[PDB]
Amino acid sequence: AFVPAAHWTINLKDADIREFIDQISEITGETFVVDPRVKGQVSVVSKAQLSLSEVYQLFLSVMSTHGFTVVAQGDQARIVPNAAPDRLETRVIQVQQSPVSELIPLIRPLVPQYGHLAAVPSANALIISDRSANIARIEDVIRQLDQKGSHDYCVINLRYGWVMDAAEVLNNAMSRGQAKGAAGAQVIADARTNRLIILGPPQARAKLVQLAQSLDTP
Amino acid sequence: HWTINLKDADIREFIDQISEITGETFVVDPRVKGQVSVVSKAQLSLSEVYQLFLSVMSTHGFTVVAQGDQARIVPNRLETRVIQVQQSPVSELIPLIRPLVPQYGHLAAVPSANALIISDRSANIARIEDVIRQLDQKGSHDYCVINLRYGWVMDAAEVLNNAMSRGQAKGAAGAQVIADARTNRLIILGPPQARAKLVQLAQSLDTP
Ligand SMILES: [Ca+2]
């Protein structure tokens, strides 16, 4: 259930989706007619405190995650099916130092197609839907990116190379101190498009981009 | 295949025209209303016409809900236009064009026809189409993103474009810039040398 923290926190595990909806009505005061086809088990977690409006946003993210949407029929609000692993958790992740919008494109490559990613700018938080072990891993990536001063980035679409090989070569070179002028830059592999995302301060990023290009030469 | 040019028609007519084309039967909720303009000069398959239908419904805040064989249309000036892309994969251009589409608008890909569906004011559509024509190329688009700290992207973009068109940006010629006003960031495109140069100029512009 939602626990007062008017703000609230939540730690609901393996609950019927219908229970979650009813719970949202109790807090919001909104009333929903739930289509008979709406079914499923949900896990919803927020250690960050949420306002009433942010709770509604979380509700929409959970609905969207499981393929449902809210419509108006017959003078009432209706939850209906909209046109993946069994256990999915929807977690709210608060970001401390950086604006959430700047981190979104850097973490999208870690979100699977079945998953969900949304910004909650009023709380400077991200909503992510995934299996719990995947979420913990992403939370660490967020924590690390959040410590960085810059989130500017360059994208390289590899024509010849395999994205994982290239990422491995670039990280090892930096680890060994073998990348000259790129120390401080960082690489993120984005397999779905066979592309690299290079980030860092201007001079280091410009050098790592050049180095990355050399791994993709015909 | 079908083409379309529907101007200022009741949305209920558009729904009827989609039913005749697709054979789908729809039951429209009494609260459904609105005027639509829908254009596709490109020839669309039955399935692609249905994709267009979904884009128009979504554009005006309507959801289509399966009810067995039939489908229920329920609530949750803009023109909806289909734009053909010749060389670039449509799915690649999507993220690059989205910054230009306002939140009241709509943007969707039709990968089987390699076309984009956009809903916006006719004048902003014409502007995007120029941007698409310039982006359109056989090779992939490498790019750089700059989150501005001091400057404003619509101003910065204008300065960078003016310098390139007027000949003040030597070396950056051929590069392209897309302003993303929602997050105050620039997207810099083009061949490697031009792109790298335009990045340096953008960076010089955001240092006070
Ligand atoms: Ca009808």
Swiss-Prot record, chain A:
Compartment(s): Cell outer membrane
Annotated knockout phenotype: Loss of export of PrpL, elastase LasB, chitin binding protein D (CbpD), aminopeptidase PaAP, and metalloprotease ImpA, still exports LapA and AprA.
Region (N1): 86-149
Domain of life per record: Bacteria
Region annotated N0, chain positions: 6-85
Region (N2): 150-218
Coiled-coil spans in chain: none
Domain notes: The N0, N1, N2 and N3 domains are periplasmic, while the secretin and S domains form a channel that is partially inserted in the outer membrane. The N1, N2 and N3 domains each form a periplasmic ring; the N0 domain was present but not resolved by electron microscopy. The secretin domain forms a double beta-barrel structure; the outer barrel has a diameter of about 140 Angstroms while the inner barrel forms the central gate with a small pore in the closed state. Isolated N-terminus (domains N0, N1 and N2) assembles as a hexamer of dimers (i.e. dodecamers).
Family per record: Belongs to the bacterial secretin family. GSP D subfamily.
Record text on subunit structure and interactions: Forms a cylindrical channel with 15 subunits. The closed pentadecameric channel is 170 Angstroms long and 140 Angstroms in diameter.
Function: Involved in a type II secretion system (T2SS, formerly general secretion pathway, GSP) for the export of proteins. This subunit forms the outer membrane channel. Among its substrates are PrpL, elastase LasB, chitin binding protein D (CbpD), aminopeptidase PaAP, and metalloprotease ImpA.
Protein name: Secretin XcpQ
Gene: xcpQ
Whole-protein residues included: 41 to 274 of 658
